[PDB]
Design a protein around this ligand. Structure first.
Ligand SMILES: NC(=O)c1c[n+]([C@@H]2O[C@H](COP(=O)([O-])OP(=O)(O)OC[C@H]3O[C@@H](n4cnc5c(N)ncnc54)[C@H](O)[C@@H]3O)[C@@H](O)[C@H]2O)ccc1C(=O)c1ccncc1
Ligand SMILES: NC(=O)c1c[n+]([C@@H]2O[C@H](COP(=O)([O-])OP(=O)(O)OC[C@H]3O[C@@H](n4cnc5c(N)ncnc54)[C@H](O)[C@@H]3O)[C@@H](O)[C@H]2O)ccc1C(=O)c1ccncc1
Ligand SMILES: NC(=O)c1c[n+]([C@@H]2O[C@H](COP(=O)([O-])OP(=O)(O)OC[C@H]3O[C@@H](n4cnc5c(N)ncnc54)[C@H](O)[C@@H]3O)[C@@H](O)[C@H]2O)ccc1C(=O)c1ccncc1
Ligand SMILES: NC(=O)c1c[n+]([C@@H]2O[C@H](COP(=O)([O-])OP(=O)(O)OC[C@H]3O[C@@H](n4cnc5c(N)ncnc54)[C@H](O)[C@@H]3O)[C@@H](O)[C@H]2O)ccc1C(=O)c1ccncc1
Lengths: 268, 268, 268, 268
């Protein structure tokens, strides 16, 4: 009761109880929203994880790279929430980049095939999702994507960064198409969070030199952030996503809200 | 009940039922917030205007340029809301610039004295206000200033623009000091709104050539904004200010939220 | 004699006497630089075009998407300019995007395969070129790419824009690798120029609605640009590229110089 | 002979052989430019310093805050370079901020009077200078100001930063007025340089805590800069200023060129 009350959100990207979408989904349900979830290949796996959320919600399979899914999407969602009911929010907390494009291989060594598979799932996928769901969304609705500041080159994230720069730009062209439907398209740029995947790298999985850089990346975050930064609490970013699906930011589209403690506005 | 429920906000800058603070103040009271107001020289005047708000709220005199006020501020607010009660929000919907620094005189003709009086009330004043009230604010609190995109030079606003560029920067150094107290310092950049003062210029008060430029400025706003733009409805911007005093954007400080329909992210 | 005197530049992207690289190449030779050129598929074709430049220069075949070329590149260039002589400049005036990703098809209708082929030739290719040539460049050298402002969404350029946003980001990660070799990596963001390819679209080739938008795009350029803008004179942008290969901007890397008359700093 | 050959530049801001204008002036004279210099209060003092430049040049007294000077300026320059000869370049390597507004006093403690005197000499003064000299400049001319990146809040520079944010904005409105005359107005944002004034602070003059911050500021500069950074060599920035008065960047106005080694494009 409050904020997301009586809205229908479709949260994607969950794959562990650590995943930044899981935390969005929880806060959403906490605000009175009827959710719909999305999965990839380990389905039975996320089914278990999702079964832990404050309340029950469906799980539709969605491999962003798969055409059939993107075509089937619009309908599958309808049967789930009831026909004649339209979608109020779409969270795109999804992204991917192979070991090579990330920190194991240096920038110049990642082949386009990998660099491609990457930009497809993190950049382009936002657009293909906006397409497949736009028709069934309520006006005053909201589409939102998870992103990180790519304005400055930083070590270790190598290509995943470019992927995000593309993503930031795609958001702007999605802000156009959505506009006609009276839908807002935004991006929340988050600071680092120890998710299962992030933790693994800091643990020296994708190279020792990479894990050390990401180690020194987080370290510098709380240093700049005037309100500090807890890289193990996804609630703060999760609650900003809510503010962006709630009708409280009704005049902002093709934008980026920063959930990073203010680090991006500080030099040192 | 909801959002601003049980918080104490101090809204400043009201001077007519058209003023963008008046609309903030109303939406705030609408959300269950105990307000405190600020005035300048026409006091009995705004007393009448404020008496129209959803509920009763005090009115403390505050001339931002006057030292005595800035010193007296911290206490005057305390007696009003009760000693032992701390301030949860501070809205700085205030700004000024003489005819010369605005559109009547061309950029080069405005003398520093005027350019000064301007930057004092619109730029520096944010800081002097953060100082005078910071000590009595609750952690998790929020300070917010009204601003407009100065990244690109535009006609008619001449110096008032620079004033805002300074303002955008002062916000960042206020984000530092507030951080220790666990307070957030932000800026909401709004599109144009027909306030009494704005209407007057569009009516050719400050020169005919200026009024025509501001005429063609608003005209181009809805053209770019994907969700359109109503320059006679301050609610949208007013509700974004609320989102920023509500604890729903808890990891953003020294920032700028755009309440402009998305115009700033579109070229044409 | 002067500026580019006694330097070795490799200019790529020529395909007509209208092409923005052709104009770079000419101004370069005009400044006393020994050039090397690059071609794609219509070779005999550009051989004729290049034969018109102020002085003779070689022509090496380079299909940016082809591995063999990128491997063969480093050597082919060496035999040309003489072994033991190193490259002083690298111009990447190259880019591509299919009809669909441009203005014929709306944003949502362009398939990843096309969106891919696009980003490969305009974004990633800068990096693969930096790799293949970095080893043979003289310290104090310079790599430069042709780009356009993607910060704001604009009609008609649809995906080619994202391609450029990726490009702007890749430049920053190329600025790193080049740094060790003491090489600078930059981008010159140009205004519109009536090249053969541009002229064709303004002539309603890729749709009538697209040609009209690009028509109204150029129209608005000279309107904002304080020094005006001639979209049929590539010299201005061509001479900025020279300033960036000359050792006169020796402390700027991973950057973007604007050759647009100042339009990007003006709103209206 | 070359670059600045046969041009007339007016370099301001010299006050020691360490001053970043002195180095501009030298490189300028090195390029075949007839210079004109400007002084403040210690005249006989800079007369000695300037007498050391590669060749002889006049010295006109110019206190930027003084009206009489700004009125007298246009003529004094004419008698110097000969009537009927017009000015080709104007360097505004000038700025000031009291101890309090800098690092001795924290942000909130600097009084507007000081904050004023500061913004007057570093922000507004650029405009008043553009006015007083614009009438006598040759088309294709160039006005240039010394600046530093203010986008992110940083310690120690406190208000001098805001002063620069205002400065960056004033440049854009000067880019307009100059445009009609076909003059370009730009800003070169430099990294730190050990000038007499800078050295003094790093030596703990303006507080020990401030000197340590500026100590750690420079330290972090070379860390980010891909091509490194020598904070004791003003030549690199001085040669970028030349590139901007030379007619080699002819399509850039109301802009900022970065002479910082690329630090501003790198995070860590
Ligand atoms: N590290 C962080 O905590 C962080 C996360 N985000 C973004 O937030 C999103 C969520 O990431 P997370 O929760 O940390 O990790 P996650 O991997 O748990 O969740 C994302 C999903 O990728 C999904 N997957 C891959 N391909 C497909 C596909 N084809 N179809 C459907 N699903 C697929 C997968 O199923 C998983 O659910 C990503 O796009 C992140 O980049 C944004 C910012 C930060 C960040 O990465 C960062 C980096 C550098 N500086 C500052 C911050
Ligand atoms: N035009 C708009 O509707 C607009 C307004 N704002 C800002 O919002 C704030 C509120 O302005 P408004 O409500 O439109 O006008 P307003 O004049 O009604 O309210 C502001 C106040 O200035 C106050 N005043 C002057 N000096 C003092 C002082 N010394 N002490 C105390 N009070 C003083 C005065 O009492 C009045 O209450 C200003 O700072 C605006 O610049 C931000 C954006 C836009 C805007 O101006 C704009 C401009 C160009 N492009 C896009 C948007
Ligand atoms: N329109 C312009 O004049 C313009 C041009 N540029 C960039 O400048 C570069 C040169 O373009 P141009 O000269 O106008 O056109 P061009 O097509 O004549 O030259 C570029 C080249 O693409 C090459 N080609 C395609 N694939 C390959 C490959 N695989 N290997 C080798 N070569 C290949 C082709 O051979 C040709 O030489 C492009 O990357 C442009 O985007 C930058 C800015 C502007 C611009 O497009 C623009 C757009 C929107 N707002 C403002 C400006
Ligand atoms: N520290 C640096 O080396 C540096 C210098 N600049 C700017 O370059 C300009 C030159 O400074 P500098 O040479 O280092 O020092 P400088 O003090 O030797 O020269 C500037 C002048 O101020 C002049 N002065 C004061 N008031 C007046 C007046 N009213 N009329 C005429 N002259 C007056 C004075 O006569 C002197 O000639 C300043 O505006 C700087 O801020 C730009 C960037 C950097 C920088 O400060 C910086 C800061 C933070 N991060 C990165 C870089």
């Amino acid at each position: 009761a409050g904020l997301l009350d009586g809205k229908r959100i479709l949260v994607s990207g969950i794959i562990t109880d650590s995943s930044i979408a899981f935390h969005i989904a929880r806060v959403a349900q906490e605000q009175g929203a009827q959710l719909v979830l999305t999965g990839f290949d380990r389905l039975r796996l996320i089914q278990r994880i999702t079964d832990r959320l404050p309340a029950k919600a469906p799980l539709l399979e969605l491999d962003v790279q798969n055409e059939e899914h993107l075509a089937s999407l619009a309908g599958r969602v309808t049967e789930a929430i009831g026909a004649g009911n339209k979608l109020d929010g779409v969270v795109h907390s999804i992204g991917f980049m192979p070991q090579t494009g990330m920190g194991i291989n240096p920038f110049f060594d990642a082949p386009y095939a990998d660099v491609s598979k990457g930009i497809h799932i993190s950049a382009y996928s936002y657009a293909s999702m906006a397409k497949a769901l736009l028709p069934i969304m309520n006006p005053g609705g909201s589409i939102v994507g998870m992103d990180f500041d790519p304005s400055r080159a930083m070590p270790a994230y190598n290509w995943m960064t470019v992927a995000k720069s593309a993503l930031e730009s795609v958001n702007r062209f999605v802000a156009r198409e959505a506009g006609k439907y009276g839908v807002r398209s935004n991006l929340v740029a988050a600071g680092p969070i120890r998710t299962l995947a992030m933790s693994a790298i800091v643990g020296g999985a994708l190279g020792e030199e990479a894990g050390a850089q990401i180690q020194l990346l987080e370290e510098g975050w709380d240093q700049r952030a005037p309100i500090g930064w807890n890289m193990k609490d996804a609630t703060p970013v999760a609650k900003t996503v809510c503010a962006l699906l709630s009708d409280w930011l009704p005049a902002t589209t093709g934008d980026i809200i920063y959930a990073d403690g203010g680090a991006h506005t500080q030099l040192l």
